[PDB]
Structures are given as structure tokens and as C-alpha cells.
């Protein structure tokens, strides 16, 4: 046991791409890659990643046919979006050194993980809020606050002015009471039920088993 077999379970990992309910790609562990006639004519026009001439076959078809709007508005989007998974691909790729076609390993994966650990953290280290209390703490609950950060970002977590002074208080108990009282724990208790018990303990126990 260990931080990113924590993540792993609690955030999840993906060998494949997947496109998020926000329109984000991501892979691996919350690795992120990429961020009526008339109206037909308007956004197909106006799509990011069409070509000139990709773009002139959907324009063009719509003169052809204007009542058709409604499908050829529906191709534009299809290709800008194939398009965005290409482009994530291809951001994939120089991370890992290959052509992966959006497929990793979870040695690829883990590796792509160490380094998001690695930016979290120093985004924490210079987080005037996160900093007193991630240094105050030893590596486990360490692994806890960073586990929180991968869920909500630094700036959510920040915000959790009076846990965390509890926490940088040594006030394990306090603090573990305090954060099952968040609209966080409400809204994925299971995970935050772990996360808090690791706060408390400073131990792994809560990913036993499971």
C-alpha cells in the first residue's frame, strides 16, 4: 500500500481515453489531456477543429439541402469532436513515447501518475493555505491531502479553512469529525470516509479490505 494504489482506488484507472462529463479527456488516473437553418450554418462555421475544406463539404452540403440541418449539424459536431480525441491522442503520445492510439499500461499509467503527484504538490508548497498544514503532516496523511487535491483541485481544498487548521493542529479526531460534517462527504461519502479515516489514523487501514 502505498499513494498510488490509494488513487487507483479511489479515483479510478483508465488504460483507455475516456471524454468526461464535462467534455475533458482523460486516461489513467484523472490524468487530463485536452481541455433553425440559419443557426445550422452559424456552428458549423464555427466549429474549432474542422478544416477549411472539411468544413467547405458540410457548408456546401447544407446549401444543397437546407432542410437537412438537422444531420449535417450533426456530422460537423461528430468530426469536431473526433478531432479533439486525435488531438489528445497526440498529447498522449509525447508523454508516453509512442504511438499508443489512446491505450496505455498501468506501468505507463503509474508513471504519468508520479508526475501529477509531482505538480500537485508543488501547487500545494506554493498554496499560502495548503502549505503550513501539508508540511506539518508526515507521509500518509500527506497522501490524504493530496488525495483531496486530485479530487477537487487545489483551490476546493484550500477551502477547507478550519479542518485543515485542525489537521495542521494535530487535532486528529477533531479534524475527522469536522470533514464527515462537508457537502465533500455527502456527495461521495465512500471515498471520503476513507480519505478521513486516513487522516485520522495516519494509516492505511481504511483500504484493507475492501
Not at 452540403?61 to 468530426?79: I, T, V
Not at 478531432?83 to 505507463?108: H, M, P, Y
Not at 502549505?131 to 500518509?140: E, F, H, M, T
Request: net charge positive; glycine share 6%; hydrophobic share 40%.
Amino acid at each position: 500500500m502505498n499513494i498510488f494504489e490509494m488513487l487507483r482506488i479511489d479515483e479510478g484507472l483508465r488504460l483507455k481515453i475516456y471524454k468526461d462529463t464535462e467534455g475533458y479527456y482523460t486516461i489513467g488516473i484523472g490524468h487530463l489531456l485536452t481541455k433553425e437553418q440559419q443557426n445550422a450554418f452559424y456552428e458549423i462555421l464555427h466549429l474549432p477543429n474542422l478544416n477549411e475544406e472539411q468544413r467547405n463539404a458540410f457548408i456546401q452540403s447544407l446549401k444543397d439541402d437546407p432542410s437537412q440541418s438537422a444531420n449535417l449539424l450533426a456530422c460537423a459536431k461528430a468530426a469536431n469532436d473526433a478531432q479533439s480525441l486525435c488531438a489528445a491522442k497526440s498529447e498522449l503520445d509525447k508523454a508516453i513515447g509512442r504511438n499508443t492510439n489512446g491505450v496505455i499500461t498501468k506501468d505507463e499509467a503509474e508513471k504519468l501518475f508520479n508526475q501529477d503527484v509531482d505538480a500537485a504538490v508543488r501547487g500545494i508548497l506554493r498554496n499560502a493555505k495548503l502549505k503550513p498544514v501539508y508540511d506539518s503532516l508526515d507521509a500518509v496523511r500527506r497522501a490524504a491531502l493530496i488525495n483531496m487535491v486530485f479530487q477537487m483541485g487545489e483551490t476546493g481544498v484550500a477551502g477547507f479553512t478550519n479542518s485543515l487548521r485542525m489537521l495542521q493542529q494535530k487535532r486528529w479526531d477533531e479534524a475527522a469529525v469536522n470533514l464527515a460534517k462537508s457537502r465533500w462527504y455527502n456527495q461521495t461519502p465512500n471515498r471520503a470516509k476513507r480519505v478521513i479515516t486516513t487522516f485520522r489514523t495516519g494509516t492505511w487501514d481504511a483500504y484493507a479490505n475492501l
